[PDB]
A paper describes a structure:
Arl1 is an Arf-like (Arl) GTP-binding protein that interacts with the guanine nucleotide exchange factor Gea2 to recruit the golgin Imh1 to the Golgi. Here we report high-resolution cryo-EM structures of the full-length Gea2 and the Arl1–Gea2 complex. Interestingly, Gea2 is predominantly composed of α-helical repeats, with six domains arranged almost linearly from N- to C-terminus, except for the catalytic Sec7 domain that rides above the HUS domain. Gea2 is a highly elongated and crescent-shaped molecule, and two Gea2 molecules dimerize via the DCB and HUS domains to perhaps confer stability and structural rigidity.
To study the Arl1–Gea2 interaction, we expressed in E. coli an N-terminal 17-residue truncated S. cerevisiae Arl1, carrying a Q72L mutation and a C-terminal 6xHis-tag. We found that the N-terminal truncated Q72L Arl1 readily assembled with Gea2 into a stable Arl1–Gea2 complex and demonstrated the in vitro binding of Gea2 with Arl1 by gel filtration chromatography. We determined the cryo-EM structure of the Arl1–Gea2 complex at an overall resolution of 3.3 Å. In our cryo-EM structure of the Arl1–Gea2 complex, Arl1 binds to the peripheral surface of the DCB domain. The binding interface involves the N-terminus second and third α-helices of the DCB just outside the dimer core region. The interaction between Arl1 and Gea2 is predominantly hydrophobic and is mediated by Arl1 Switch 2 and the interswitch β-hairpin. The Arl1 aromatic triad (Phe-52–Trp-67–Tyr-82), along with two adjacent hydrophobic residues Val-54 and Leu-69 form extensive hydrophobic interaction with the Gea2 Pro-71, Phe-72, and Leu-103. Notably, the Arl1 Tyr-78 inserts into the Gea2 hydrophobic cavity formed by Leu-79 and Pro-100. In fact, Arl1 in our structure binds to the opposite side of the DCB domain of BIG1. Interestingly, the Gea2 heel-like motif is highly dynamic in solution; it is invisible in the Gea2 alone structure and becomes visible only in the Arl1–Gea2 complex.
Residue numbers in the entry:
A (entry chain A): 7 to 30, 70 to 259, 321 to 440, 454 to 785, 792 to 866
B (entry chain D), D (entry chain C): 18 to 182
C (entry chain B): 76 to 259, 321 to 440, 454 to 471
The structure:
């Protein structure tokens, strides 16, 4: 770098001018002008870098030159970048680098056969990778980085190009993804304590065509490009565009997502948009691929991403993990054998790579009611698959894996038992309340079924057998607010609106949180956990309660600023009837803008029109009407209990089970003493012990190798120790008697 | 068979003027850094139009394009009066370039349809357009988003081109 | 692989685990033959993932040895196959992994013999006419990056002695480019001057009158470009190192003069003249007899050959007096 | 189709022994990281030989490489006897493997040319080879650069192989 940059630039100008003259007008003149301008100089003190780079950029971008001249320009620019001619201490270096990346993205030439085209495009890809990796790439903007991502991804997902170019594009994509999410790793969390309403649309970033060859934007790149990149990656692997992308593209999208998660870590929780994209639609696509695929490579990539998610972000993806594991167990206990082998291996990666997987699953699920039993079902499925009877008609490599899982459970339970001083463990006389309420899960299921069929029987049942503090209206409202994962929500709609229950309705609606939210977000959070009834009067009553609550919980001030305000707190103060009218308008606009049967749509015109005269008999400001209109045009109002039956069913299941719970966004092992951990171990062992002991004995008897026998006898020794510690007399007697026999 | 050059400072709506001429629509165009070329078939004669960017780092590149040029459209910006002196200096440099002498100068000033728009006579006198010699000189105020004057300016240019031959 | 999985099962971190044990199965399945292209491709992908996500780092046992073993495996990547596109893809992965390793601090912690082997491997790929075109261009780009890194590191070492007198006794005909066997101070130290001297000697071997018929025109042009990049990065500091300066002064300038005087190809003459004018501009106060002789020969050529040679000479010499 | 597994710690001289067997010429040996395979035939039987290195990070893969192996060579560096206990432990562990019960523990006490070479009887006593469960005991000294006991050890190995069947 100690050489004078002027001589390098002049030499490149000379070689490009000579090449153009040999091949053969404005471009040659530009190079001659640059040569003269820099010849009458000694250092680059006050000459802008864009002027120095412009002829090269024109050669790169203009689609009227041969591949030879374009390749020469690319070589000159790479030589400039390697030698660091455009330093930090040069005028307009940000502009120069942004311009050069813009030129590379739109590179076009009229060239010879495909070999030269591949060479030139490889040069483009290498220069982009170098620029992004350097800090000069950190100074690029959101728009420029998005263009880079689109270009490299389109090259990497094109079936009309050489495999070498595709591999180079894939390597560049991995590097750029690492760079972007590593930047995300240390930027800032925005609005940590402020709630998030999911309003972004997931269908606004689609992959462009391969045209290369033959805050906001204009600012340093940060979160916006990360969100757009996750949206594009979702579009690659989305269920709704299976026909528009090949299998290689879907696999590469899954690999990119996994690399991004590995580089970022457990920090996507702080950013609500990225975590929403990871939780709802990406997991939906993962589950769809798992359930409805036949190719092994795609299933392997999907399972690897799923297990990465469970290992990293498992404390915030509990419902999705429950649903996916339940589907996996349904698959494994009913598809060719190779699919089942792939599932069982990629799920085997879990119980080894987690602090204590079965204990943590039993703590989170299978104890928190309204969640299906996952740990016990997992262990039962593993035991049933471990016997050679399940080996028949399926893959032979499954039973050893399942046996490994069972032995891992036994070993982890033994590890939680090394120094616990059994006498002091027995000294406890107060059982944990979690297990006490867990023992009454079947009664809760019966009460919930009674509530679903008719509340008039469910409520007295739900108060006689516990599960509700008292028959007071506040307690019923609290129970319906919180515990509704298995309670039917159409029934909640038809009960919370019956005229006699106008007190429970009022308390339930007052139990929400609406401070600082517009009417759109308030309606989203109201309908998130409550299905509107059918009759007009019922909807009227629910909307009236909501309007009263929203006005009471959003105490306004006489400031009453009108227009010229992107604020949404002190700007609009709808009294009580204004909220009623606006909420009805929002509900109607939802159906109007998202009913494909009706031709045409209700535009903003006259939609702003038949609303004036509501907010203190005037019109709502332009910002508010525009915002609600956009927020309904995108992200249709998510409502519970869409429809259950035939035809489209996976979408409804995902909507009800995940999308309702992901509208508003706000481990346990480190929070529990060893004694509580051993209590949970005692519960799970009581549930699943005889099955494990019998399975181990079957495997041991039927085995012939010495290693298998030794490992199984050691596992039975550990089981005997566990039985002695917790005083499981029947199991201890069973184990020792079978060994003696 | 004609080479019309559109030159002007950044923000004069040169790309919008070009696209309005080509198809007749309002198109949002990002600030260009290189050049864009399209063709026009307004009359029986077919003309090729070259549009050049207006940033400070590319004006010498404008100076490179002056070859076999038939007409020049020096679109100016009708705001930011502090930039008028620089615009006039660049216009004088372009006029005294000894190659574009045998051409016709046309000015649009498309920013009249905005508050605080300068008078056409006022800008013509301030830019010393009257000091021009031995060259066609005619300015036509217009609105890029709406039009009206764009057709008038193109009509004058094509008429003077016909009168040239 | 199964044993490594068993060893790593239920371990919170790689605290006491040696890094070479972690990487050994991958390196074994990369370097050995009789392993199909698909499996070695997957192994290279795994190694690249372990590098892009820093896993063997400053806080791991035997990380220096781990990365050295990775590079030693890469320089001997051999495999079998059926088609040629798979071979090109595998070798592209090899080249990319080498470029990633060398351009990292862990590359700075490598060895003299290891860096020389990397140079020879990538140069054999970049100077082999039997490969594809994209692979060769990738190899050439990697060679230019590695050269820049090596000579940048050259611009941090102090010269061995500034008062002693250096006597030219090291021979030039010792390093020759090796065959492309890939596909189907002393060594063992952090690399410094010895690898730079060997690299410059190899580049001289590419462009030399005695080796003229054993190399194609492309190889010689690439060697001239590499020497030019080395000079441009290094600068006027090459005269503080006597051996590098002797190689630049006597043999490389002899080669430049021979090509200027006895060559008809235009591209080779252009590369030679670019290197010559770079030498005049950068190191001209220490190369006076050479510049005198070369200029006299050039004037003899111009004042006595389809004249396109003369136009090339006059332009590439005109770069001087401006 | 015989299987020969040359084991031993770093610096023992396994590569030198393999080179002397294959070509009978002393060649400089780089520290091996993987394995070297050179199938040979002494008189009438093929000798597929696998060589394994040390570096204190490949011994688990030493355990991995035990498969259908009948010949085991455990060259131990006679010099620097402090490391001999580690070799004793490693060979004991190798014997304890269930897949090498029918092997034949043969050890070459190489580097006899270097000063202070340990006596073969004392080395074997330190190896407690008499505790073998009727497998073999063939501690034979040799040299790598020169052929002193290599031929005798090869004769012993081929003789026990022939006596197998
Ligand atoms: N409101 C309004 N804006 C205009 C009009 N004409 C041009 N513009 C502005 O011009 C911008 C478009 O950029 P260009 O057309 O490329 O302007 P330019 O003169 O070519 O300068 P560059 O952007 O550097 O190429 C728009 O963002 C408008 O703000 C007009 O008639 N009305
Ligand atoms: N001169 C001489 N050297 C010997 C003799 N026996 C062993 N050596 C040394 O042993 C080394 C043999 O190298 P290797 O057989 O590859 O050692 P290794 O067992 O593979 O262990 P690593 O080198 O760490 O891979 C030579 O470099 C010699 O220096 C001997 O009898 N005479």
């Amino acid at each position: 770098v100690t050489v004078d940059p002027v001589t390098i630039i002049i030499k490149e100008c000379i070689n490009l001018s000579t090449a153009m003259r040999k091949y053969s007008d404005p471009f040659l003149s530009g190079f001659i002008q640059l040569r003269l301008m820099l010849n009458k100089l000694k250092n680059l003190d006050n000459i802008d870098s864009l002027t120095i780079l412009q002829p090269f950029l024109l050669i790169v971008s203009t689609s009227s030159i041969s591949g030879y001249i374009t390749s020469l320009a690319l070589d000159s620019l790479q030589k400039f970048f390697t030698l660091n001619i455009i330093n930090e201490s040069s005028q307009n270096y940000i502009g120069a680098h942004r311009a050069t990346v813009n030129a590379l993205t739109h590179c076009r030439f009229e060239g010879s056969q495909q070999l030269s085209d591949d060479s030139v495009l490889l040069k483009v890809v290498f220069l982009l990778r170098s620029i992004v990796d350097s800090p000069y790439g950190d100074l690029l903007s959101n728009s420029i980085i998005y263009d880079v991502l689109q270009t490299i991804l389109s090259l990497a997902c094109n079936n009309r190009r050489s495999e070498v170019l595709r591999n180079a594009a894939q390597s560049t994509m991995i590097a750029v993804t690492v760079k972007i999410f590593s930047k995300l790793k240390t930027i800032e969390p925005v609005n940590v304590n402020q709630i998030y309403i999911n309003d972004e649309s997931y269908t606004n970033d689609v992959l462009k065509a391969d045209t290369i060859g033959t805050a906001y934007a204009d600012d340093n790149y940060g979160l916006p490009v990360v969100r757009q990149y996750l949206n594009l990656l979702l579009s690659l692997i989305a269920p709704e565009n299976e026909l528009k992308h090949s299998y290689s593209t879907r696999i590469f999208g899954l690999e990119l997502i996994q690399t991004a998660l590995e580089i970022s870590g457990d920090r996507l929780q702080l950013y609500p948009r990225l975590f929403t994209l990871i939780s709802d639609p990406i997991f939906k696509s993962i589950l769809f691929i798992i359930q409805n695929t036949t190719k092994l490579s795609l299933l392997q990539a999907t399972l690897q991403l799923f297990t990465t998610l469970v290992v990293i972000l498992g404390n915030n993806l509990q419902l999705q993990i429950e649903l996916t594991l339940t589907r996996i167990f349904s698959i494994l206990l009913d598809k060719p054998s190779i699919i089942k082998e792939l599932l069982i291996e990629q799920i085997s990666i879990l119980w080894t790579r987690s602090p204590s997987f079965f204990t943590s699953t039993f703590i989170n699920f299978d104890c928190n009611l309204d969640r299906a039993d996952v740990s016990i079902n997992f262990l039962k499925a593993l035991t049933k698959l471990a016997l050679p009877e399940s080996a028949l008609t399926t893959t032979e490599s499954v039973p050893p894996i399942c046996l490994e899982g069972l032995v891992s459970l036994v070993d982890d339970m033994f590890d939680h038992m090394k120094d616990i001083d059994r006498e002091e463990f027995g000294r406890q006389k107060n059982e944990m309340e979690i297990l006490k309420k867990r023992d009454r899960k079947t009664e809760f299921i019966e009460c919930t079924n009674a509530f679903n069929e008719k509340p008039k029987k469910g409520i007295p049942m739900l108060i006689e057998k516990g599960f509700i503090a008292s028959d007071s209206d506040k307690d019923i409202a609290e129970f319906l607010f919180n515990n509704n994962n298995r309670m039917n929500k159409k029934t909640i709609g038809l009960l919370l609106c019956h005229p006699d229950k106008v007190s429970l309705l009022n308390e339930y609606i007052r139990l929400f949180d609406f401070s600082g939210l517009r009417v759109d977000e308030a309606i989203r959070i109201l309908l998130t956990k409550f299905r509107l009834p059918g009759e007009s009067q019922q909807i009227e009553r629910i909307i009236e309660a909501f309007s009263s609550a929203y006005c009471e919980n959003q105490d306004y001030d006489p400031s009453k600023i009108s227009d010229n305000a992107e604020d949404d707190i002190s700007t609009v103060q709808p009294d009580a009837d204004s909220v009623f009218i606006l909420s009805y308008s929002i509900i109607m606009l939802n159906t109007d803008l998202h009913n494909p049967q009706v031709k045409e749509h209700m535009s903003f015109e006259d939609y702003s029109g038949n609303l004036k005269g509501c907010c203190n008999h005037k019109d709502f400001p332009f910002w508010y009407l525009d915002r609600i209109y956009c927020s309904i045009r995108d992200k249709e109002i998510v409502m519970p209990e869409e429809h259950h039956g035939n035809e489209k069913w996976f979408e409804d299941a995902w909507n009800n089970l995940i999308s309702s719970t992901t509208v508003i966004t706000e481990s346990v092992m480190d929070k529990l003493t060893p004694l509580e951990l051993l209590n949970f171990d005692r519960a799970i062992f009581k549930q699943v012990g005889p099955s494990i002991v019998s399975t181990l004995f079957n495997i041991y008897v039927v085995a012939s190798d010495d290693h298998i026998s030794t490992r199984m006898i050691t596992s039975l020794d550990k089981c005997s120790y566990i039985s002695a510690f917790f005083d499981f007399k029947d199991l201890f007697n069973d184990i020792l008697n079978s060994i003696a026999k | 068979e004609l080479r019309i050059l559109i030159l002007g400072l950044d923000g004069a709506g040169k790309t919008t003027i070009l696209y309005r001429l080509q198809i007749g629509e309002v198109v949002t165009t990002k600030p260009t850094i290189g050049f864009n070329v399209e063709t026009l078939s307004y009359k029986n004669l077919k003309l090729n139009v070259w549009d050049l960017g207006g940033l400070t780092s590319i004006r010498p590149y404008w100076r490179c394009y002056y070859a076999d040029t038939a007409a020049v459209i020096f679109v100016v910006d009708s705001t930011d009066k502090d930039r008028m002196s620089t615009a006039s200096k660049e216009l004088h440099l372009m006029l005294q370039e000894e190659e574009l002498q045998d051409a016709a100068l046309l000015v649009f000033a498309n920013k009249q349809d905005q508050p605080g728009a300068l008078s056409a006579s006022e800008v013509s006198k301030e830019l010393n357009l009257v000091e021009l010699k031995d060259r066609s000189w005619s300015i036509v105020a217009s609105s890029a988003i709406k039009g009206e004057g764009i057709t008038e300016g193109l009509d004058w240019l094509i008429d003077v081109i016909k009168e040239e031959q």
